[PDB]
Structure 1
Amino acid sequence: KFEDLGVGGLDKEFTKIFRRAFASRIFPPSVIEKLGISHVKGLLLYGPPGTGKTLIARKIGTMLNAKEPKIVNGPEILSKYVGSSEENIRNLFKDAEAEYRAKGEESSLHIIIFDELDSVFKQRGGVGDNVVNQLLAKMDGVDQLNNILVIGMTNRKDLIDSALLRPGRFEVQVEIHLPDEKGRLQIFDIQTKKMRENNMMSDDVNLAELAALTKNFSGAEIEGLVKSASSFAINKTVDIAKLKVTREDFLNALNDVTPAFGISEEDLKTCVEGGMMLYSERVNSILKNGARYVRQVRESDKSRLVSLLIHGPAGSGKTALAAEIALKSGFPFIRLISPNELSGMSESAKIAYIDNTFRDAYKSPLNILVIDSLETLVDWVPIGPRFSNNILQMLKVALKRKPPQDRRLLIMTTTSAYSVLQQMDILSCFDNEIAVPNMTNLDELNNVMIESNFLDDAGRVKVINELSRSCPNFNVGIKKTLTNIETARHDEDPVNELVELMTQSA
């Protein structure tokens, strides 16, 4: 029916394909001749990479007899001699034409698989125009040819020429989603079949739990997971005929693998390497508000987009709070945009990266995406002043677009130049705002130094008393506090350095 072959999770799409594509190649030729209808001569199926497009193409080829598929990929076609970039697109149709001319209407179906159709075949109006014209004149031209079928696969369907998508050239258009919970269960069933019949899979593994634990897995990462678990088991063993793979191997392999549409733990973990100390009452309120907004986004029906701004004095430790709020939510898709990643690229590459990261957040059920700085991304310098308009306009457009279909998003941006944003007139894109004030007190410093154990209580008391008698209006961020504490620790005497540093810093 559909799953007797190796494809799981794709049910509706395959019914559509079977009804529209192979509903005229199965019936007796007499009936179809009486009806007076031709055959479909194209198929464009698009979606995120690594989801099972080539597999379905090859299975379609196999299930209908047909010769071996002829495979090609976009950028390989081009050459650097006149008339060679289009000769390659002409050599793919020779054999089918010859067989059609020789045999007639009893020929055998031929298949041609095209990969990355949006790299060369872009709207015309150069080598590109010639290539598009040469394919256009060959797919449907003056000479009839109805013993062929060409499949095309792509990830961006809104760049292909507008005449290559007309009934007669590429008639059927299909979309491939990511697997659902049942899709993952079925994929697991298909993949763990050799180890099942051959009696080398323990009786403790419960694939339902494994499917439930894997979220946003793409269907190929499952294959990697199972293979890695099997390799782990064998390598642990080396009784060679008594190998058994248990739950522990699978769980370890799962722990090792990192999905492509999942959390990026390392960055969000190194962003908070200094630790989260509750030095006052504000921190709890900030975190509570963050949690409130997370919950609102999760449980709403009409609120499918929420953009949040967090701002305050420099050094107040703003990115750490955002990272902690993100790390205590549980969403399956978390991503970060920081100046470190972008540095070194050109403006065009910067825009491309900022756009692609926003186009991968519309293919998952629940997401959360963090933007850092927002003033160094725009290249701001106060003399003249200077900055980049293109990136600014890109970010402005991206912060107001609702996600497609039924999805959800929570953008969270940090800044420390409120006034500049006000001048640029960009403050209408944000829904709610949070402020992060810095330390103005002495008990806070005492709490910080007890939590960091700067010294024994004797020196701590002495230094706090000295500062109380000297500095009345202590006002500094938490980064400078920590760095000064460390510097004093590695230096000699508390009052000699710590007090002097604090006095010169406040």
Structure 2
Amino acid sequence: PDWNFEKMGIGGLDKEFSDIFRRAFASRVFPPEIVEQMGCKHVKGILLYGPPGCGKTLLARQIGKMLNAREPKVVNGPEILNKYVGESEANIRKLFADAEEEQRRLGANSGLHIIIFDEIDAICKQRGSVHDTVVNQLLSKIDGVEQLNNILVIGMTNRPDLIDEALLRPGRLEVKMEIGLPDEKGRLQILHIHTARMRGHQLLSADVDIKELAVETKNFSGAELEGLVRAAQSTAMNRHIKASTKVEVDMEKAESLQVTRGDFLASLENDIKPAFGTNQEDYASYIMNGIIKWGDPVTRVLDDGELLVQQTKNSDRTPLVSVLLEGPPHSGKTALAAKIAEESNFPFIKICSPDKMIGFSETAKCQAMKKIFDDAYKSQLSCVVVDDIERLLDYVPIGPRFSNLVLQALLVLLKKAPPQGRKLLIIGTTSRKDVLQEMEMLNAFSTTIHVPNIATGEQLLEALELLGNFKDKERTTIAQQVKGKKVWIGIKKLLMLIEMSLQMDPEYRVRKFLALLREEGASP
């Protein structure tokens, strides 16, 4: 009555198991006398959906085991498809032969047969963005003129909004469910289960706390914890063999192959890369030279970002926030966005950009953006960054010319609430405010911030001091010449100019740098 899930695998899904047994399989756990006296028919299908690699197959196999059914006949979606005519239907019909045979011979006493579909969304006609006959055959077989009373079909899918509606009516697959990402308790349980054999031989637990490893893994999924365990084992073995080969140690340590905490923490740091979690190896690719404070505006922008983060974290009546950074070109409006995102400590941080869409048509860009937002919707806290909204739209002053589909997709996606009980933050970046204002986009954004350039000689002198690429004697002349206060330059352009000037002999450096700076006498 109270089930036995926790004993064998399926570490973190107790509540789901209780719910599923309470909801559907009520007539299979009753004295058949009363059930027959009432005349109630059993359920003939269920459906599970969620993120990949979260433990759906294990649940299906355990459900099959608990009901004391025959061996399941697993099947995969793409495998059931062919280019010839009337071949997919044969594959679909081939599954129920044993069920028909036992329904005929044994009459009304045969046992259960469970079929396990996978990627059921592959064979479906809803892809408006497939041989409709296939789903027609499946529905005819599951429910038709001839009735089967000893079957149970379990479905699996990653996208639950691509499923044909007719396949979800009562009498067919009619009990849905969601297996979500695990939490702390779950992570401790999965880790203990997987590690429970190694500690059997007392070759682990050498000052390695499972709870410590558990609070380190923030948004790890199921299979990735096992992958971390595997990688730690392999790395420790390699280290031990190398060390023993290096030194003529006695047999005492030659036998010792113990795994260490340092192995679990190095493998976590450098080997496993989460799919739904943070990613530290791409921030350096944007904020390369770091943030140097050259004036108040940097402090103002960072404080405003902190305030917005605090507003979005703890709040109610407003679960979606947006913001836009605007400024003249070469002002460094991507480094600041990256820094603001990093300083929030959110579990899921992502950075979309056009660098990974070279040559893509508009439709592919729409699909990629939709997938990124779908990933963002599967967590309790999120932060998405859009790099250059002008390049994503494919804008060009002549014409004007651009793509409307991507613009409509962005406009719709900037005003969509996440599923119940979750928060989201969006941070844009652009250098053309007027065009966006003409296109009505700026009305959608909740707020805006301004990123100015350098405008005073003292600011440039302080920037040069902080960067440290010129000496006092040269600094004197530079200050004398820049006292005129007529300066309009960007930090990136300043870096480029300095590196261009530093290429010649130590005599003409100041003169060349001054000439180049003077040539760039812009005037807003």
TM-score band, normalised by shorter chain: over 0.9
Partner Cα separation in structure 2 for residue 123 and residue 354 of structure 1: 20
Q: Does 1:397 align with 2:400?
A: no
- Partner residue of 1:255? 269
Shift of 1:42: 0.6
- Partner residue of 1:433? 448
Shift of 1:83: 0.7
Give the one of 132, 136, 139 matched to 1:136: 139
Cα distance change on mapping 1:212 and 1:124 into 2, 3 Å: closer
Shift of 1:30: 3.0
SS in 2 for 1:310: strand
Partner Cα separation in structure 2 for residue 250 and residue 447 of structure 1: 45
Q: Does 1:311 align with 2:314?
A: no
TM-score (norm 2): 0.93
Any idea what the Cα deviations from partners look like across 1:78-125, whole Å, max 9, x if unmatched? 211111121111111111111221222332321211111122223499
Q: Does 1:447 align with 2:462?
A: yes
Q: Does 1:184 align with 2:187?
A: yes
Partner Cα separation in structure 1 for residue 119 and residue 488 of structure 2: 58
Partner Cα separation in structure 2 for residue 106 and residue 197 of structure 1: 45
Any idea what the Cα deviations from partners look like across 1:296-332, whole Å, max 9, x if unmatched? 1112122211100110111111111111111111111
Q: Does 1:490 align with 2:493?
A: no
Q: Does 1:212 align with 2:215?
A: yes
- Partner residue of 1:243? 257
SS in 1 for 2:12: coil
* Alignment root-mean-square deviation, CA: 1.7
One-letter code aligned to 2:145: V
- Partner residue of 1:100? 103
Partner Cα separation in structure 1 for residue 143 and residue 23 of structure 2: 19
Partner Cα separation in structure 2 for residue 230 and residue 319 of structure 1: 40
Aligned length: 503
TM-score (norm 1): 0.96
- Partner residue of 1:76? 79
SS in 2 for 1:382: coil
- Partner residue of 1:194? 197
Does the 8 Å contact 1:124/1:161 carry over to 2? no
The sequence identity of aligned pairs, in percent, is 54
Does the 8 Å contact 1:370/1:412 carry over to 2? yes
Shift of 1:146: 1.5
- Partner residue of 2:303? 288
SS in 2 for 1:474: coil
One-letter code aligned to 1:267: D
Give the one of 411, 421, 427 matched to 2:426: 411
Partner Cα separation in structure 2 for residue 56 and residue 224 of structure 1: 20
Any idea what the Cα deviations from partners look like across 1:337-376, whole Å, max 9, x if unmatched? 1110122222211110011101111111111111111011
| 340-349 or 328-337, which deviates more | 340-349
Does the 8 Å contact 2:191/2:225 carry over to 1? yes
Does the 8 Å contact 1:229/1:249 carry over to 2? yes
Any idea what the Cα deviations from partners look like across 1:442-484, whole Å, max 9, x if unmatched? 122212222222222212222332344xx64111111110100
Partner Cα separation in structure 2 for residue 488 and residue 356 of structure 1: 45
Shift of 1:485: 0.4
Structure 2: runs of 5+ lacking an equivalent: 242-252
Partner Cα separation in structure 1 for residue 331 and residue 174 of structure 2: 58
Cα distance change on mapping 1:240 and 1:68 into 2, 3 Å: farther
- Partner residue of 2:377? 362
Partner Cα separation in structure 2 for residue 56 and residue 143 of structure 1: 30
Cα distance change on mapping 1:405 and 1:452 into 2, 3 Å: same
Partner Cα separation in structure 2 for residue 116 and residue 128 of structure 1: 16
SS in 2 for 1:401: coil
